[model samples]
Target chain A: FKRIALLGMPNTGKSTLFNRMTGGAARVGNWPGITVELLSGKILLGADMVEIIDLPGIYDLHGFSDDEQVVRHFLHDNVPDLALVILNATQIERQMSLLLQLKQLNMNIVVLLNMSDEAKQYGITIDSRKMSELLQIPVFQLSTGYQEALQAVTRALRYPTPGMAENVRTQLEQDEHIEAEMVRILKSAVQIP
Target chain B: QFKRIALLGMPNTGKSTLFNRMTGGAARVGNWPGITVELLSGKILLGADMVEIIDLPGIYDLHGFSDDEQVVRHFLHDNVPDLALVILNATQIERQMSLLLQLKQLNMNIVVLLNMSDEAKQYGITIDSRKMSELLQIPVFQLSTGYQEALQAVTRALRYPTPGMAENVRTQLEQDEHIEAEMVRILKSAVQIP
Candidate 1:
């Protein structure tokens, strides 16, 4: 009934979206390496008081730095009931790399497609439904500035995948295949004089 | 190298704007959250001195409250650099002073840049730099970061002066209070000053 974890890359508006979701009760610590300022807040979900843990914006899963290490420990050891993974739509190429890494961690991820508004303006369209199929988990398009999508977000959270989530065993496999293909394409695109 | 001068302070105290002026618009991180983290490696040359000026993340305290605070604390304690420039927003002295108090105790060769000097002037908040120097036990320079001339005043503090030590009276009071009231009575009081 409680314990939801939020993870995202930097400047994905995770803090702003976190404040919107869990009230303005969170405090960001001074810097990344020194103070692992743990902040948690309660959200009344039905009769249950759910605690939401907003993590720092870590760019990659592989790092010994405080932010990266903190999340790495939480994901591997203290796995939460639900993990809300936010990604910036504008920086999809860079974000996809992180998303692929998170998928390998095998947490119950709810990929929140953040900054869809900015992405749309940039002529980028993310098919969350397709992404859900690709990632084998619940996908949500969220922009806190526009509150309409949030209604669906909370509804999805309340309902969830309706049952046990579809195992993400093949998502990482898919990620590897896609990455190989991309590298191959880039290799093919090269022209030597 | 003159020094890798890191101008550290809290949010919206004109650190980026000051950086913009001193080190061109390149140091201006705009509104990016972790831009200060990146700017720490950015260098600023002042005359013959190849001063690698950095902008540490805006923080309320040097105490390791979170990941960010921990990094700043580690930097302060371990590196123990030649100079630690603590930029305090003048208009918000009461709020900013608590953090300044902690930094002063670390007892690094510190310089206090009284930022937002113009706004403090507007509010008729005339802080006597000499009094602040006496109280905080650091070299205090009253300067509006908005003015280039005032920033030059900060640059001038680089000249190592005849060392004057102000007894850390406030920090001692805070330490005694923490041990007496919080440490003895409380079990989970890592947040004594936070």
Candidate 2:
């Protein structure tokens, strides 16, 4: 049962990932009762097929913004088995706050540090394995420009785990504190060196 | 390759005023076809390029949502333009980014002309051309179109966008959802700062 959902902040390479995973072959449609258009498609991953749902990029999960609320509601209602949380490695600190919140939501996640090629230009290097270890999840460095990480994701999906219930609740409860710590540390360490 | 450069901006950003100064004529205020939306385009020769410039209707975004936006969108898609002069009011960047991003995706050689430079200066709206160019990765120029010689300044800024520049804005994933929420979340998110 591999229903993979692609979620991320805008322009962080989520749509680019969709194009990579589904070959840009989704049926594009405008959502009913709203003017928001979306693309949805399925990927035939072996043993466990993956249905890819491309959700709108929201600034926060607090649902402060209307678009945020749309994505927030979708995540809350239908929990997917594997959520590819794409982050702009160029600006991981601002993105990590959202990442921490998503991790807390108890979604089975794969932290995709996308645009690593561009990150190097800004001298921002991602220790994907370290980030995966820190977050207690599988972190994959995905290069959308070259489609190199396709096999890595497909391999991970072959062996899946149940959503961790306690972690999700704890992450939500401690979101504010975690977010603040993340920002402070991120500011101190993250730079274009 | 018209020398004249007409100013096109988001709604109610004083596009007429810019046109008036460029054409040496009075602003003929009128609406576009079948709608209450206004459109004004005229000729203003910039340096050696003496061309007829058309001030198109004010559009929030060029995703073809409103007939007005569709008007400009269709024209650009079909007509051959040596360059398109995109007028942006200084104080409203976020509101303009949606349209700017979308326009950048289209097949038009563009000159980003920021208006209300005098007003912007009064309000301390300082636009860093370098930063703007970096963010958009496009050719940009500053102007108080109300000033004389504005067209010449605009024409000089016209250049072919670097390869892969136009393709950067085509984030097809977000565009699909943007169009979905076009009537709902968009236009409302856009605000005019005075």
Candidate 3:
């Protein structure tokens, strides 16, 4: 069974969307028989058994916080087929910095701008297609009641989206230099207008 | 009578920038959350009064959910800063005000610094500090990179005696319904939360 990891910051509706995708059937489980922090479930998508893992909410991968370490450990220990990055469109300027950080990992990714409807109501405009082209990853808009976007996740996971980097450690050491680069990338990748 | 002020705000709200400017210390600030992951503190002279300012990690809510959130909650519960200097990005005032109201409801003495006021001006967004202060029943200041003026305003405001926490705020917030109802009321009165 292939695995898909759902990753995002706090309050970005990862678990809400996870429950919708799993039809409220997701259960708490341990990863690699170590910690019980991860919530995962088995979903059959078009003749494929996909295991979706919901990671802990973390702001920065290089952050010294405990949850950050948990996310970093999960990525290093359990390699997922696709990393579904969730972003709240209203706070795209700040939230997308995490997406930019993840892209440096050279892993398969699909960005989902959740709560886009609310973003629009708040007068936040995001060009999803342009964002996709800029980051070279598929970006989708997801509203509160839109369960249709979950299908896109399954479709992206079905294919061999991308290969993992040869040495994951090469990307592990996050410092001030990488942060400056992340900010630079965010300035170019994300926009308000 | 003395005070220890903890600055709290969401990520990317220029909290660190303001802290660096106010304290005259480099403090390893960043636009992101990686560098200064823990609390950073420095002392400053506020109108003949020496005040200690501690900058906690940026958090969306003070509710004990995530690690950072727990850090804030515990800090408030145990340390109990005499005043909580909340930093808000004026551009994102809508969602940011919720956190401000939360701190207020927690019965913390709060002073809101609407950071990035210049950017908000550029965006044609105007926030009447007097109106906001009147509504929230706390002092609110429009703060920008102008360190001298901001320091003066904050120093003057800091002298205003810290009010005693309401007797029932903590108990009331324990009831989830009470908190939600109060939050909805506050949001309705303040900026719109989307």
Candidate 4:
């Protein structure tokens, strides 16, 4: 029943964002065929009745834990339209690991660095425009409850349907690889208070 | 009749700084962000050759129609200089290079002084003076606001001037519209604007 999957770490505001995206649809319920604990909601997005299924929130996508396995199976059936890779803006340094891993998967995606106001409170600043340019994907810095963020997501989805993403080279050494990229991205697009 | 030399550039490019350095008196000096609205003249001897140096107002375009531009137009038409020293701000080369291109098309014997080299270094901008000199077929020098060696090099250049334009370059200056391609061609190897 998943048309768009929300992949993120625990408490990264995935469910909160989901509620806002489908807030006007009059109902929130479970997915039709999933045995795992998953929540699904239907929204009349653009010209289609797209379903957004909130996947299990985990710190790592490659772990063999039950919740991570559920995510693995979800990606195994990767015919979905897009994955909204949610990130905690306040902890973008570490949260970017999940994103780097997701970039290794062949699926259409965009980055949502949520809780941007909280990040600002912690003296963090992110240049979403530069981040978008460097990643070659749409990026947004947002707070979950902001009504305007819903429209931002709508605009992002309305973009020319991005072709199936090519999987990033998975030659091990990701700890250093991811760390180096984090440095490059931060130097170009972030300011820490 | 004195042989003439003109110092020309966009505003705030240190025409007055170099003017003060060479001509030695009576010129205002500081950051004016496009200032000294009138022409100032002085005399200097380069290698036993005495020439009158006129500090033309910093102009954005040679052919643009403005009061200041009209004055420059009339002056150049009336008394063309023996050599034109262009003071360019290295930091603003991308936007300012077109002015230099206009003077080149006019067949003016040109010497480019890449002024404000100190400030450009703060932003990691460096120019290949030798390569630029090769491409434009004239002398190009990089210097700070108070650099003295370039004036000495310029003295040598002045002793024997060189032409940048060919025989077919029309003496009549037509408003050539497509210089950016030519500008980019020169910029690709000469400028590292990072």
Tens-digit per-residue lDDT, B1-194, candidate 4? 67667888888888877777778875433222233344567777776777778888787656443346545655665556777888888776655665676677577777888887777777766666676666567777888643565667566655664553322233434322122222234234322232
Residue range A85-149, candidate 3, lDDT tens digits = 99887877557657766766777888888888888889777767666665677888888435445
* CAPRI band for model 2: incorrect
Q: Can you list each candidate's DockQ?
A: 0.01, 0.02, 0.02, 0.02
Candidate 2 or 3, higher DockQ?
A: 2
lDDT by residue (tens digit), candidate 3, B1-194: 35777889988888777778778885542232223244667777887889878788788655424457645664555456767788888887755665666677677777778888878778867767766666567777776644565567566656766555433434433533233334334323422333
TM-score for each candidate, following the candidate numbering = 0.38, 0.41, 0.46, 0.40
Give DockQ: model 2. Answer: 0.02
CAPRI quality of model 3: incorrect
User: Candidate 1 docking category?
Assistant: incorrect
Model 3, residue B38: distance off in Å is 22
Pairs that collide in candidate 3 are: none
Q: What are the fnat scores of the candidates, in the order listed?
A: 0.00, 0.00, 0.00, 0.00
Weakest lDDT window of 10 consecutive positions for candidate 1 chain A? A184-193
Runs with alpha carbons beyond 4 Å of true place in candidate 2: A1-193, B1-6, B26-39, B121-124, B144-150, B157-194
Candidate 3: list runs displaced more than 4 Å: A144-148, A161-169, A173-193, B1-194
Please list the C-alpha lDDT of all candidates, in the order they appear: 0.57, 0.57, 0.67, 0.63
Best by TM-score: 3
